[PDB]
Amino acid sequence: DPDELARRAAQVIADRTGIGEHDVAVVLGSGWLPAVAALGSPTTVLPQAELPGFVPPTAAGHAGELLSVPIGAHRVLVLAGRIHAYEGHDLRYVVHPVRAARAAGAQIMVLTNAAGGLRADLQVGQPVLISDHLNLTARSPLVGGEFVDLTDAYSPRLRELARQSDPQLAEGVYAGLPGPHYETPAEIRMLQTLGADLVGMSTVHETIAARAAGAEVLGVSLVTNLAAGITGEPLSHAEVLAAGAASATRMGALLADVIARF
Amino acid sequence: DPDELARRAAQVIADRTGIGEHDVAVVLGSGWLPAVAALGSPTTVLPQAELPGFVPPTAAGHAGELLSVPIGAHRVLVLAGRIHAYEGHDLRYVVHPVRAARAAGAQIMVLTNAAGGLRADLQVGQPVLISDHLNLTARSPLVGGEFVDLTDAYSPRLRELARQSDPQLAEGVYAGLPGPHYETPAEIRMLQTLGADLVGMSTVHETIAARAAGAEVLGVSLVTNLAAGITGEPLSHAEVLAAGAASATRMGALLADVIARF
Amino acid sequence: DPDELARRAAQVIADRTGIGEHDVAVVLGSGWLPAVAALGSPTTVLPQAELPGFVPPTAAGHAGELLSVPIGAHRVLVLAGRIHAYEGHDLRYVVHPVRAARAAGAQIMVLTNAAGGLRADLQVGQPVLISDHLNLTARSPLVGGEFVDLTDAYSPRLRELARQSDPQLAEGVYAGLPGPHYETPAEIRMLQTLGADLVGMSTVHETIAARAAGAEVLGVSLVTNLAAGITGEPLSHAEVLAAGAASATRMGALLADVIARF
Ligand SMILES: COc1ccc(/C=C/P(=O)(O)O)c(Sc2c[nH]c3c(=O)[nH]cnc23)c1
Ligand SMILES: COc1ccc(/C=C/P(=O)(O)O)c(Sc2c[nH]c3c(=O)[nH]cnc23)c1
Ligand SMILES: COc1ccc(/C=C/P(=O)(O)O)c(Sc2c[nH]c3c(=O)[nH]cnc23)c1
Ligand SMILES: [Cl-]
Ligand SMILES: [Cl-]
Ligand SMILES: [Cl-]
Ligand SMILES: [Cl-]
Ligand SMILES: [Cl-]
Ligand SMILES: [Cl-]
Ligand SMILES: [Cl-]
Ligand SMILES: [Cl-]
Ligand SMILES: [Cl-]
Ligand code: NA
Ligand code: NA
Ligand code: NA
């Protein structure tokens, strides 16, 4: 049962961190892992593979960490690494971290991602708040009769707090695709038609599960490249990592500054 | 084999109803179940869970009924409850009722659904004939080399009969999504671009399977809400049920009136 | 492991053909199988079902052949028949032939398909070069962290060579859908919005796997019908086969002429 696995994981988290409730959770994936060093100093570091329900039996050798980090007056669970849908496992693994974090007390989920920029104004290394999303995966993490409204899924209140940290922050619509291939130029022209400003390979199911669980969500993209066809140059995964490493200090300091306002 | 399970189910239906052929079938899901009481008086009521192939081993406790109802001069199989794709089981469960109904003699399938209204003209409680659909599930119920043309999938002849019952009936294009989450406002703007007038979580596979089996299809949506982003208010599943209960008499009397014209 | 199965298949191919490296591969599916007789004279003909990894245990009775054909100065592996995604098996079966062909030495993949024409200029029996694609399947054949850029997926260099064979060849964007049902007219209007010129049921995963493996790709569609809603007439699978048989000589001679330029 997903709820039961989430409660079991939250109990292990409380026991191993010695902290009974974490009120905020942050998910870092590719593009954002370097930012951990500027975000804060963990008081507990746990391998995801040691926690119930996090890592598929299939491969345990590539999973990241769960961190307990004090940020302002909060106790923050930081997921340092995602198991992406493109690994080919059930979505329960994608959204179990959100569900476990909620069961541990998290009222707010900060979901970070890397993205390709579709919109005219965007630059490599630019953070962009997610105002809404397009789920283009043809999937949902909700199974059976679990209904959730996604109006204001990306909390307006939390985007306002982020704009206090940086009043020039852009905001835009994120298209979540399966991956792991990059899009063709024709696909990017299609996404422009569909109203996407950003394109990536994560996040949409985490947002849905978070809202279904009653948590508020803040989404932040790092633009790692302009999308296929815009510059004419080929894309490469090296760009994602390079942008993450280059932006690390700024991005960690931004997240810490915003979370302290919660 | 799906054909074999459909023939076995049709034989149980004939045996238990005492009726050798049902010439019409109706599928009622959320939004439409209250209409049964105005549609007619069943002569046989069977739990779906007692019929071969209807209900996944996984959960038998939420499935509805199969009714045998005389409507005009017809003998009508009424599926009172669907197993939706969002329950997470193979599509064979979604379309097995259509295939079983065909094997029982059904020449016409009336597929009802609840929908969110995308178009400017629509109101809560309004019935809308389905003129065409957009299958946005990335799935098909047809497996292997079973080809079907979907031109005039929603029989023009049957829509004309429905307009005899009510000459002011609107018609529009239904977008079938996986569900079970509601759409974001950005998703609804996308669906408007794609040409959808109605959005829901059923029907498209039933229509495909019906056409592949050689049955004519009439589709009828009940608008239960305007789609996300139109009013600015959040959506809720309570709206679907409330609209169904409020419209019950009108909707049952409409279906009976149209089916009598077949 | 897909790589291991591809290497095992390539070793069987080398052993049974007596040819240590095939430098070009061609995939023929519905619409194109008749063209084999004009393409060349195979030196070895193997059932796909005898080769590691080609055919699912589920059904071995419908799979085609693998041919070794000398075309110009090349040694060409010709896949005479595809196992389509709509058969319902893992994508590894879809893309295993490309991966096996690469492991056998193939530097260039020629991927043929049948398609419905969405664009104003197109005629039944017309070959059209694929300039780009839209993958509308919500799937990828790449599993885990295998990243590939799809800029110039359909090699500009190879399309130029094809235009030497026939300077009037049209080019357009191919939309790959799951199938096996045809599209509704509303779906076709949607695909026009999304920028598709051609619509079919194959190819996109083969292209992705080919690019990930480091092969160049040439894509060629045969227009077998105008898409749903354009003429108003219903579509039928008979049209695909009839167009394939009628175009056989021209299409085989075209492929041979282009491959000799590689
Ligand atoms: C190319 O390989 C990857 C692998 C993983 C991710 C997401 C990781 P996350 O931080 O969400 O956990 C991305 S995201 C990404 C940046 N630019 C593009 C692009 O142009 N198209 C589509 N997607 C992306 C790209
Ligand atoms: C919100 O929960 C549900 C659950 C089930 C159904 C379908 C049942 P059926 O009668 O087809 O068997 C719907 S349908 C529906 C009404 N308004 C919307 C909307 O705005 N978006 C998308 N879909 C719907 C909604
Ligand atoms: C109708 O049945 C089939 C079965 C198989 C294929 C593809 C075989 P391939 O050569 O790629 O291996 C097609 S392709 C096709 C032609 N016209 C249409 C159309 O109008 N819509 C969508 N698709 C097609 C159609
Ligand atoms: Cl990650
Ligand atoms: Cl990273
Ligand atoms: Cl760039
Ligand atoms: Cl129902
Ligand atoms: Cl109801
Ligand atoms: Cl409303
Ligand atoms: Cl084939
Ligand atoms: Cl053929
Ligand atoms: Cl035609
Ligand atoms: Na995740
Ligand atoms: Na059903
Ligand atoms: Na294939």
Numbering used by the authors:
A (entry chain A), B (entry chain A), C (entry chain A): 7 to 268
From the paper:
Purine nucleoside phosphorylases (PNPs, EC 2.4.2.1) are cytosolic enzymes involved in the purine salvage pathway metabolism in most organisms. The enzyme degrades (2′-deoxy)nucleosides based on 6-oxopurines to the corresponding purine bases and (2-deoxy)ribose-1-phosphate. Purine nucleoside phosphorylase (PNP) is a well-known molecular target with potential therapeutic applications in the treatment of T-cell malignancies and/or bacterial/parasitic infections. The results are supported by a crystallographic study of eight enzyme-inhibitor complexes and by ADMET profiling in vitro and in vivo.
To obtain information on the binding pose and interacting residues, crystal structures of recombinant MtPNP in complex with inhibitors 18c, 45b, and 45q were determined and refined to high resolution. Inhibitors 18c, 45b, and 45q bind to the active site of MtPNP through eight direct and three water-mediated hydrogen bonds. Central phenyl moiety interacts with a pocket formed by Tyr188, His243, and Phe153 sidechain belonging to the neighboring molecule within the enzyme trimer. Compounds 45b and 45q have different substitutions at the central phenyl moiety. The methoxy group at position C5 in compound 45b does not change the overall position of the inhibitor within the MtPNP active site and only affects the position of the His243 sidechain. Substitution by bromine at position C4 leads to changes in the orientation of the phenyl moiety as well as the shift of helix (same as in human PNP) to avoid sterically clashing with a side chain of His243. These structural changes do not affect inhibitor affinity toward MtPNP since the IC50 values for each inhibitor are similar, leading to a conclusion that the active site is flexible and the movement of the helix allows the protein to accommodate inhibitors with different substitutions at positions C4 and C5 of the central phenyl moiety. Crystals of MtPNP in complex with 45b and 45q were obtained using the EasyXtal 15-Well Tool, hanging drop plates with reservoir volumes of 500 μL and 2 μL drops with protein:reservoir ratio 1:1. The MtPNP/45b crystallization reservoir contained 2 M sodium chloride, 100 mM sodium acetate, and pH 4.6. Pyramid-shaped crystals grew in 2 days to the size of 100 × 100 × 100 μm were harvested after 2 days.
